[PDB]
């Protein structure tokens with residue numbers, strides 16, 4: 049059962065999968081504290097036109113560096129980065145680096161906005177385990193439309209220790225980004241706006257890396273696929289099938305979740321993935337030489353876990369056309385032992401309860417909306433504490449992928465009121481988003497560490513998030529804690545606020561954008577030592 053497609057008919061599987069280019073830093077600045085190099089980047093948020101339908105008009109987008117997806121960052125563990133996000137668009141922005149324990153003022157607090165004609169310098173630690181992060185807009189009440197129109201990109205945190213694992217490698221070669229979105233188009237090929245949608249924006253056109261229903265030519269060997277659900281509201285149940293046997297699911301392995309590698313690969317033939325979740329998959333095409341393998345999406349609202357509307361072609365994601373032979377021998381492997389996962393110390397303390405539902409017309413957490421400044425701070429947790437949170441969806445009529453900032457967490461338990469599922473094998477490691485499917489209650493366990501500050505948690509269905517399913521917690525310290533905590537706990541701290549710029553000095557790379565000015569600014573930021581407590 050599915051609904052007729054609304055968007056114009058598209059030429060299925062005729063356009064190759066695009067690969068976002070790697071973003072290169074402009075320069076490096078010596079950290080005056082420790083003498084190590086900090087990589088500095090400039091990203092310009094700007095409108096651009098993109099022809100999605102070959103035979104129609106074009107779509108109006110707004111993206112990081114004028115592309116969508118934004119360019120891919122590739123940063124080694126231990127190297128701090130500063131990214132200057134320059135707003136040259138027409139709406140405010142707030143960048144969230146999802147997956148990073150950034151300080152509160154560098155984390156994308158929804159009120160911490162940059163207006164057009166201003167920029168903000170974000171200072172990132174890059175100390176956590178190798179993982180696929182992503183960076184995307186988070187501006188209050190306009191997050192769905194900003195993300196939908198193109199403000200999302202990948203940020204890979206790498207670790208040379210994992211290179212010894214000899215997994216399939218090479219960005220855009222055998223290590224392939226798979227950014228999933230679900231959108232809708234007008235009869236003339238422009239995007240249909242999410243504005244006015246207060247329930248969920250499902251979309252009827254499935255994209256990978258910004259392209260509707262692409263294909264990729266692949267060799268008959270192993271590939272690493274980095275899946276991200278960057279959709280506004282659509283959740284997926286991904287499986288692979290030979291086009292000659294479209295209903296036989298082909299096995300694959302999940303090797304990583306939001307926060308990094310699993311302890312062991314999880315043998316999988318169906319991957320549930322909801323908004324903002326990342327899973328890394330290895331698929332072996334070697335038994336399918338000369339065949340076409342279709343990446344598909346489970347119907348019936350993700351097999352009854354979700355409520356998503358299904359359309360004529362939302363069961364299709366993309367096609368892999370497998371060559372008869374490899375160019376070079378495949379010498380990659382998937383080891384049985386991937387890593388020691390750094391789970392938090394377990395706690396017996398009663399889980400803190402959070403309920404995700406509606407209060408009248410508004411999506412809420414414990415009956416509160418983010419707009420409610422006096423009531424949105426729902427938890428105080430001393431830094432260093434391990435807490436379990438019980439995340440409750442009592443409803444059959446919505447589902448909610450919940451994101452908690454700052455932390456990595458372990459999924460402890462899931463109970464479905466429909467008896468649909470419990471904890472999945474690929475939820476065995478550490479995560480930062482967890483899907484509350486229909487009538488699901490999930491307990492997660494997290495170390496609220498190592499940095500004090502006020503942070504968000506929310507549903508990552510961006511329609512729900514905007515109206516208004518988002519709250520905050522404060523990871524607290526005592527007054528004698530030190531570490532310059534006083535200037536790093538408040539996300540709106542004036543020191544770190546956006547600053548105005550003139551387009552001339554930006555394009556000329558002078559004034560505030562001269563090497564000297566950038567150097568002085570970054571060296572000043574570095575002296576405050578924001579990430580020292582992790583060292």
Ligand SMILES: *[C@@H]1O[C@H](CO)[C@@H](O[C@@H]2O[C@H](CO)[C@@H](O[C@H]3O[C@H](CO)[C@@H](O)[C@H](O)[C@@H]3O)[C@H](O)[C@H]2NC(C)=O)[C@H](O)[C@H]1NC(C)=O
Pocket residue numbers: 425500501502522523524525526527533534535537
């Ligand atoms: C989130 O938790 C923060 C603690 O981790 C808390 O910051 C603390 O706020 C108190 C009260 O504003 C400050 O206490 C002192 O502040 C000035 C400075 O001397 C004094 O004049 C006051 O009389 C008071 O004694 C703490 O200094 C401050 N701690 C830090 C590390 O900044 C935040 O207020 C909490 N945020 C929210 C939104 O609740």
Ligand SMILES: *[C@@H]1O[C@H](CO)[C@@H](O)[C@H](O)[C@H]1NC(C)=O
Pocket residue numbers: 530531532572575576577580
């Ligand atoms: C706090 O920041 C100031 C100003 O940048 C710096 O001089 C000082 O060393 C920092 N102290 C700590 C404990 O990080």
Ligand SMILES: [Cu+2]
Pocket residue numbers: 144146184324451508
């Ligand atoms: Cu996110």
Ligand SMILES: [Cu+2]
Pocket residue numbers: 446447448449507508509512513517
């Ligand atoms: Cu939700």
Ligand SMILES: [Cu+2]
Pocket residue numbers: 144186451453504505506
């Ligand atoms: Cu968030």
